Amino acid sequence: GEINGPESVLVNTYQWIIRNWETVKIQWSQNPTMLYNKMEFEPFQSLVPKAIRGQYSGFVRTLFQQMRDVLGTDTTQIIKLLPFAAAPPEQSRMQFSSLTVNVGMRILVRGNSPVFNYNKTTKRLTILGKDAGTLIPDTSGVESAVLRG
């Protein structure tokens, strides 16, 4: 884990999700609030602007409810959005294309950003230029035909 201030809070939160991904995936499927309401996400929540925390949580929880109902368990997207579900949700009709953390820096809802960057070839997640670990259901990590020899 990292120790440099707000940045480290971000990196460390996504490292925790990756390291605990089996238990997180099952809880997200079966009983998501034991996950959304975990104290693990309190530091991440303090980085989200106070005036919009609840509106972001309403958006992500609603998105997850719809995802789950029609598709079940997109690993990268569940990991990305999860910490934003931690605040008490405020429901609204607002549709967010990005979500800000104070470190504003933007996490894009679809695809990669300077803050959150998943690499399909190495199968590792990078947060603010630091490694968060390897992402995974049926050998993990780097693809074939990367190392020439």
Numbering used by the authors: 537 to 609, 611 to 640, 644 to 676, 679 to 680, 683 to 693
Please give the exact wording used by the authors of the publication that reports this structure.
Each segment is packaged in a ribonucleoprotein complex (RNP) together with the nucleoprotein (NP) and the three subunits (PA, PB1 and PB2) of the trimeric RNA-dependent RNA polymerase, which mediates viral transcription and replication in the host cell nucleus. The PB2 residue at position 627, which in nearly all human and avian influenza strains is either a lysine or glutamate respectively, is the best characterised polymerase determinant of host range and virulence. Here we extend the structure-based exploration of host determinant residues through the identification by random construct screening of a new PB2 domain (residues 538–693) that contains position 627 and is thus denoted the 627-domain.
To assess the structural impact of the typically avian glutamate at this position, the K627E mutation was engineered into the 538–693 construct, the corresponding protein crystallized and its structure also determined. The structure of the K627E mutant domain is essentially identical (RMSD of 0.34 Å for all Cα atoms of residues 539–675), with the Glu627 side-chain (not visible beyond Cγ) again pointing into solvent. This basic region is severely disrupted by the charge reversal upon mutation to glutamic acid. In crystal structures of both the Lys and Glu variants of the 627-domain, superposition reveals no structural rearrangement of the domain upon mutation and in each case the side-chain is solvent exposed and partially disordered, most likely due to multiple conformations. The temperature effects on viral replication observed previously cannot therefore be explained in simple terms of structural differences between the Glu and Lys variants, at least at the domain level.
